[PDB]
C-alpha cells in the first residue's frame, strides 16, 4: 500500500509487459532494483500504460483540476492509494479511472502487523510470479504558476483476503492485484463501468504468501538486497 518493491532491471520491467525500455532505459541509475520504494518520498517509478513505451511517472496522484502549487503538495499525500469502492465517484480519481487506468508493476510489498505496542513487518508477495501487477490510475496537471507539467499516479485499493487481513490487522486494505490475463483488458479504452469495476477484488489468498522481515530494513538504502531478508531468527 505505501512500501512497495521493485527488485527488478528497469529494462527487465519493459520486457515483462513486452514493452520498448527507452524511457525506464533513461532513469535506470534511479528505478532499478529499488527493494523498498516509500511513497511518502513521491518517487519516480516504472509505470505501465496503453502506450508501447513504459512510462516513468511519480507516485502521489495530482488531479488535473487542482488550481494551487500549495494544496496539490497537500492533496499528493491523500491520494498515494485510492479505494476501489468510491473511486468512480472520488473528484480526484472520477476521470482517470475511466480515461487514464495504468500498471503499477510490483515484486511484493510491505505492510505490519499491530499486535500490542509491537510493529512486526510482513514482506508480501504473489506466488510464482516474479513481477506482478497493481492497478493504477494517473493524471496529469500543469502548474499554473510554474509552467511545470506532472504526470501522477495512485495504487487503487481493495478489501483483504485471508492473508492480508491477518497482516494488515488496523486498516484492512491490501492493494487491487490484477491476474496476468487481466493485464491488457484492464488497459483496453473500451471497458465500461462495470467491467472496470469488476477487476478490482481481493486477491486469491492461495496464490500469495508471506514472511515475517526485519524492522531495520527502513533503515537500509532503497536498493539494498537484505531489505527483504527474513527476521533474525
Not at 465517484?89 to 508493476?105: A, H, T
Not at 499486535?115 to 510482513?122: F, H, L, S, T, V
Amino acid at each position: 500500500c505505501f512500501h512497495n518493491s521493485m527488485s527488478a532491471k528497469a529494462i527487465k520491467v519493459a520486457a515483462r509487459y513486452g514493452r520498448q525500455s527507452d524511457v525506464v532505459e533513461i532513469y535506470q541509475s534511479i528505478l532499478d532494483e529499488q527493494y523498498h520504494v516509500n511513497a511518502f518520498t513521491f518517487p519516480r517509478y516504472p509505470i505501465i500504460t496503453s502506450s508501447d513505451e513504459v512510462q516513468v511517472f511519480n507516485w502521489g496522484l495530482i488531479p488535473f483540476w487542482v488550481r494551487s502549487e500549495e494544496d496539490a503538495t497537500e492533496i499528493r499525500k491523500m491520494t498515494l492509494n485510492a479505494r476501489a469502492d468510491t473511486i468512480f465517484e472520488k473528484p480526484s480519481f472520477r476521470e482517470p479511472i475511466m480515461k487514464k487506468r495504468c500498471i503499477v508493476p510490483s515484486t511484493g510489498y510491505f505492510e505490519w502487523r499491530h499486535e500490542g505496542a509491537n510493529k512486526i513487518p510482513y514482506y508480501i508477495y504473489v506466488k510464482d510470479e516474479p513481477i506482478f501487477s497493481m492497478a493504477g490510475i494517473y493524471d496529469r496537471w500543469l502548474d499554473k504558476d510554474t509552467g511545470e507539467e506532472h504526470e501522477t499516479f495512485s495504487i487503487i485499493t481493495t478489501d483483504t483476503n485471508s492473508l492480508t487481513d491477518y497482516i494488515d490487522n488496523t486498516k484492512h486494505r491490501m492493494p487491487a492485484i490484477l491476474t496476468q490475463e487481466e493485464e491488457e483488458k484492464w488497459l483496453n479504452p473500451s471497458l465500461s463501468k462495470a467491467e472496470i469495476a469488476s477487476l478490482l477484488k481481493p486477491f486469491d489468498t492461495e496464490k500469495m504468501d508471506a514472511y515475517v522481515i526485519r524492522n531495520d530494513f527502513l533503515k537500509k538504502s532503497p536498493n539494498d538486497p537484505t531489505i527483504v531478508q527474513r527476521a533474525l531468527e
